[PDB]
Amino acid sequence: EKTLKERFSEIYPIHAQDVRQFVKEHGKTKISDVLLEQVYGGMRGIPGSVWEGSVLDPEDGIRFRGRTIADIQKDLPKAKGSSQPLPEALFWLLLTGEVPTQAQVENLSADLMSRSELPSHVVQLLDNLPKDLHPMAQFSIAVTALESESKFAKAYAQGISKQDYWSYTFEDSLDLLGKLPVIAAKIYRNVFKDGKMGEVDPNADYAKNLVNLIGSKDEDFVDLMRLYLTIHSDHEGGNVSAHTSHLVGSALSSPYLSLASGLNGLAGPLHGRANQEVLEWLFALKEEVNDDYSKDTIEKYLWDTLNSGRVIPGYGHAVLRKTDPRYMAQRKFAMDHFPDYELFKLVSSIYEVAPGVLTEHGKTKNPWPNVDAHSGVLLQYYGLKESSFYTVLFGVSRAFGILAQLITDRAIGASIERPKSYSTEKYKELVKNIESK
Amino acid sequence: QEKTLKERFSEIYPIHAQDVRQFVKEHGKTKISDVLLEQVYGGMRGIPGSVWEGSVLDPEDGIRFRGRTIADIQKDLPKAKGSSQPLPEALFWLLLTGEVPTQAQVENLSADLMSRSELPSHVVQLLDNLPKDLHPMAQFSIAVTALESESKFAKAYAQGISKQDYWSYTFEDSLDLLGKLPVIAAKIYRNVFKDGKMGEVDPNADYAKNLVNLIGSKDEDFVDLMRLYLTIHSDHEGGNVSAHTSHLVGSALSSPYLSLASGLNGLAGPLHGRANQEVLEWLFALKEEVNDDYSKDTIEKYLWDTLNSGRVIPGYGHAVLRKTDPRYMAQRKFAMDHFPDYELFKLVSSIYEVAPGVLTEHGKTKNPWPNVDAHSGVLLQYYGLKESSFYTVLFGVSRAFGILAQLITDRAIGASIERPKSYSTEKYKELVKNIESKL
Ligand SMILES: [Cl-]
Ligand SMILES: [Cl-]
């Protein structure tokens, strides 16, 4: 059977020619306006990214290569005896657009584990960093330190042609992905435990390797991380982390510098800590209700929150018109594994009444929860109680979607992202000249 | 006593914010550009997608810092005593406030940066243990990211400050970071290319002098060159990859450390921060081929060969600027006042005398004039900075002035998070087809 690289080598030329023909025959078609309020409002609504892996369906939720969450939960290969989709199977789908067989996933898992040994200088680096340096900073530092191994950087310096960039980008990406669970686990053991990691089982999959090194053999913990790392793998190219990695990657920086930069954007409080924000709100709610998850007590707390200008964290979509299927997938996991967990029963009680209160409030068009409203409770259940580590887990997942698009961008020879800038003084000049024609 | 940078800026940004607010409220619906399909598939070239106050490129007069040309800042900005060169700390004041600081204000700002220049021990340990084969730019952004433990904005945000006070902690982190950048860069240079031994910071020295001192020199002509170098590379609009990257990461409220580190990683890209080294590599190849013959006949032959072979003359040819880069002329003048007999400079000057006419007669170059990158390497080579894998670190030590100036301004006016919309190629096809069917 074909490997991932072999199958992608047959698919990318078709995509590259299709893109060139598409732009040649339709490049002059205007697809949007640029209003002054958009360049001053973070380019909101501007089509400014070509991202193949995932598209947000406003009616069915995020779609990975046309597949919904229910689609990948049904079609993607699973580990033996498990019901959860494997994140490396989704990576295959993101990169190629095709569903891999069972044997292709396991061979890809084995290939990832064979690339998972951290170089000596990275282990030394991480063991000496102070514990009060945030794990996301330690995360992107470790990723940057792997640049000495970059096959793409060496290939560029040795005059490799542009049409061969993808191959070394691919190898760097798989080299990087194999070491991400080891880096994340090393940071977790050093900062929060005794600094002792296990060893990488070469037959373990991506998620199982991360959980084992973190320090558990619980198969239910392994299944949760398979679900977690899958559903967080990709969400369009407009978000800060995806856009940052594409931007740095478009100047031909290696996957290591592109992922490290994307992680720093994911570290931003407005981007990657929605998980932590929900959990702090849950604990602040739990301290005043004291096991009372009744309809009246929760609805009163929700009305007092909505009437005080605040919002319910994790609720209210801008575009999605129903409950995030990623939220439902985590809800099914909790109901099958620990339905009587107090922190879940609190989350479940909010889900039972919060859509109705937000609707009655009338200031929320789509009163439904997202993935971040349900992820922290499951992590807490398995002992991942240190929320300052949650964005690291987010980064271990989203790196799949980030590196898939990075490989694709080099395969088609995507150009450097360089828009034009003006000062406010100059924008007032441009606008004055336009409005007086 | 005169106002500090923080005190003067705190008086200026409320005016800038109200002007931005009223401008967008009245004119927000005005269309300023189109988005063609070839643009979203072409890196958004020509798209207005950034608000960058510090610098704007004047197509006739070169890059302007808050309206000031290179000649303007050479005249108006304060200088170090006995020196004719502009101080980068002075340009930073101008980039942030739009106003020219006094001599005493620049000196107190230099002293403040030096008081924050002490690297914490875990950064010293980290840099010393990094292997020599790890690229300096990678070590540069690693060390900057390691300083995140000192971030006052990160600690204040977690405590729960108001949105109106974001800029204040962003400002402090930015000055804390600026003070340590010469130390980080010099430590890297000693460890990778020298004996790993470094001097101590002089609390009375300026930003460029501290950098040259720790690298291992006290030559005043070297210090003056670095004053000029760090000044003219400080900022160049907001569309370039490193400036755009730091704005994008900063728009998610990441600290200046993570924002600058991400910007440096973009600057490390071969298509962004290596024009200086590309020109130098091409200069050395010419010298080997011409056997040190720099005659007009010999150089013009080599230039026609390069253009007829389908290649470009590195550093020559602007897309917009219609004359020689004033930053090139400022560097040409420095060499003629310090070492006009240097052979490598005579090569650069010999090229400058004949390349514009050759490119013009060749007829394939609209603006056949050299940029700042055509002349920076030869100056760095004269004073012993011959390790070209270090030039982008020096570029970053300068460009961080403009990056951090805009990041402070972004937080002061509460700039929104940059988040455009993406589509797959399949969805773009459906979008284009529906648009064309209605035309
Ligand atoms: Cl985002
Ligand atoms: Cl650029």
Catalytic-role residue among A317, A324, A374, A409: A317
- Residue B361: which residues within 8 A CB-CB, separation 6 or more? none
Under an 8 A CB cutoff, do B422 and A50 touch?
Answer: yes
Under an 8 A CB cutoff, do A27 and B41 touch?
Answer: yes
User: Are the C-beta atoms of residues B245 and A418 closer than 8 Å to each other?
Assistant: no
- Show contacts of B292-301: CB within 8 Å, 24+ apart: B292/B343, B294/B346, B294/B347, B294/B350, B295/B350, B296/B350, B296/B353, B296/B354, B299/B350, B299/B351, B299/B354, B300/B354, B300/B358
Q: Which of A55, A121, A251 sits opposite B131 (nearest CB)?
A: A121
* Nearest-by-CA chain A residue for B266: A248
Burial-class residue A406 by CB neighbours within 10 Å (0-12, 13-18, 19+): buried
What's the A235 CA to ligand 1 centre distance in angstroms?
10
Shortest distance, CA A258 to any CA of chain B (angstroms) = 7
Q: How many helices (H) and strands (E) does chain A have?
A: 20, 5
Q: What sign does the dihedral A267-A268-A272-A276 (CA atoms) show?
A: positive
User: Are the C-beta atoms of residues A137 and B147 closer than 8 Å to each other?
Assistant: no
Taking chain B, what is the end-to-end CA distance rounded to the nearest angstrom? 67
Q: At what angle do helices B166-193 and B391-412 cross, to 10 degrees?
A: 170
User: Are the C-beta atoms of residues B392 and A257 closer than 8 Å to each other?
Assistant: no
Query: How far apart, in whole angstroms, are the C-alpha atoms of residue B426 and residue B428?
Result: 6
The beta strand positions in B4-146, using DSSP E, are: 31-36, 48-51, 55-58, 62-65
Query: How far apart, in whole angstroms, are the C-alpha atoms of residue B122 and residue B185?
Result: 16
Q: Which of B38, B252, B257 sits opposite A270 (nearest CB)?
A: B252
Q: Which residues of B are tagged catalytic? A: 272, 318, 373
Identify the helix (H) or strand (E) that includes residue A35.
strand A30-35
Q: Give the number of other Cβ atoms within 10 Å of residue A117's Cβ.
A: 14
Burial-class residue A229 by CB neighbours within 10 Å (0-12, 13-18, 19+): buried
Token pair, residue A167, equals 């191959």
- Residue B397: which residues within 8 A CB-CB, separation 6 or more? B181, B182, B185, B211, B230
Burial-class residue B151 by CB neighbours within 10 Å (0-12, 13-18, 19+): buried
Under an 8 A CB cutoff, do B266 and A248 touch?
Answer: yes
Question: What was the structure determination method?
Answer: X-ray
Q: At what angle do helices A240-250 and A390-412 cross, to 10 degrees?
A: 40
User: Are the C-beta atoms of residues A254 and A152 closer than 8 Å to each other?
Assistant: yes
Under an 8 A CB cutoff, do B49 and A36 touch?
Answer: no
Q: What is the identity of the amino acid at B157?
A: Y
What sections of A308-383 are H helices per DSSP? 325-337, 342-361, 375-381
Query: How far apart, in whole angstroms, are the C-alpha atoms of residue A174 and residue A149?
Result: 12
Residue with tokens 């940071």: A187
Helix (H, G, I), strand (E, B) or coil at A201: coil
- Residue A21: which residues within 8 A CB-CB, separation 6 or more? none
Compute the half-sphere exposure of residue A356: CA atoms within 13 Å on the CB side of its CA: 10
Q: What sign does the dihedral A198-A168-A399-A421 (CA atoms) show?
A: positive
User: Are the C-beta atoms of residues A68 and A57 closer than 8 Å to each other?
Assistant: yes
Query: How far apart, in whole angstroms, are the C-alpha atoms of residue B30 and residue A175?
Result: 48
Residues 226-285 of B with CB under 8 A from A: 237-241, 243-245, 248-249, 251-254, 257-259, 261-262, 265-266, 268-272
| Angle of CA points B425, B431, B437, to nearest 5° | 135
- Residue A334: which residues within 8 A CB-CB, separation 6 or more? A341, A344, A347, A348, A374, A377, A378, A381
Q: At what angle do helices A165-192 and A120-128 cross, to 10 degrees?
A: 40
Token pair, residue A57, equals 């369906």
Could you tell me which residues are beta bridge partners of residue A85?
Answer: A78
Query: How far apart, in whole angstroms, are the C-alpha atoms of residue B261 and residue B249?
Result: 10
Q: Which of B30, B122, B421 sits opposite A35 (nearest CB)?
A: B30
- In 3D space, the residue among B117, B133, B96, B118 whose CA is nearest the CA of residue B8 turns out to be B96
Residue with tokens 């006052």: B152
> Computed over its alpha carbons, how large is the radius of gyration of chain A?
23
* Nearest-by-CA chain B residue for A248: B266
Compute the half-sphere exposure of residue B369: CA atoms within 13 Å on the CB side of its CA: 19
Under an 8 A CB cutoff, do B131 and A148 touch?
Answer: yes
User: Are the C-beta atoms of residues A370 and A314 closer than 8 Å to each other?
Assistant: yes
Under an 8 A CB cutoff, do A269 and B252 touch?
Answer: yes
Cα A13 to Cα A16, A104, A170, A411, B391: the distances in Å are 5, 22, 15, 8, 37
User: Are the C-beta atoms of residues B241 and A251 closer than 8 Å to each other?
Assistant: yes
The whole-angstrom distance between residue A346's C-alpha and the CA centroid of its chain comes to 26
Shortest distance, CA B433 to any CA of chain A (angstroms) = 9
User: Are the C-beta atoms of residues B213 and B199 closer than 8 Å to each other?
Assistant: yes
Under an 8 A CB cutoff, do B420 and A134 touch?
Answer: no
Shortest distance, CA A139 to any CA of chain B (angstroms) = 10
Ligand nearest to the CA of B237: 2
Helix (H, G, I), strand (E, B) or coil at A33: strand
Query: How far apart, in whole angstroms, are the C-alpha atoms of residue B410 and residue B248?
Result: 11
Burial-class residue A119 by CB neighbours within 10 Å (0-12, 13-18, 19+): middle
What's the B196 CA to ligand 2 centre distance in angstroms?
33
- Residue count (chain A): 437
| Angle of CA points B422, B428, B430, to nearest 5° | 135
What's the A299 CA to ligand 2 centre distance in angstroms?
52
Query: How far apart, in whole angstroms, are the C-alpha atoms of residue B288 and residue B276?
Result: 19
What's the A271 CA to ligand 1 centre distance in angstroms?
5
Identify the helix (H) or strand (E) that includes residue B118.
none
Shortest distance, CA A346 to any CA of chain B (angstroms) = 25
Q: Which of B126, B238, B435 sits opposite A421 (nearest CB)?
A: B238
- In 3D space, the residue among B137, B206, B139 whose CA is nearest the CA of residue B391 turns out to be B137
Q: At what angle do helices A135-145 and A255-266 cross, to 10 degrees?
A: 170
> Computed over its alpha carbons, how large is the radius of gyration of chain B?
23
Q: Which of A18, A46, A137 sits opposite B35 (nearest CB)?
A: A46
- Residue B331: which residues within 8 A CB-CB, separation 6 or more? B228, B232, B372, B375, B376, B379
B134 contacts on A by Cβ (under 8 Å): 121, 145, 147-148
Q: Give the number of other Cβ atoms within 10 Å of residue B329's Cβ.
A: 18
Q: What sign does the dihedral A293-A299-A305-A311 (CA atoms) show?
A: positive
- Residue B299: which residues within 8 A CB-CB, separation 6 or more? B290, B350, B351, B354
Token pair, residue B39, equals 């643009």
Catalytic-role residue among A134, A271, A337, A361: A271
Could you tell me which residues are beta bridge partners of residue A62?
Answer: A56
Resolution of the entry in angstroms = 2.4
Identify the helix (H) or strand (E) that includes residue A56.
strand A54-57
- In 3D space, the residue among A196, A234, A224 whose CA is nearest the CA of residue A55 turns out to be A234
Q: Does B142 touch chain A (CB under 8 A)?
A: yes
Task: Look at strands B48-51 and A420-422 and give their pairing.
Answer: parallel
What's the B224 CA to ligand 2 centre distance in angstroms?
28
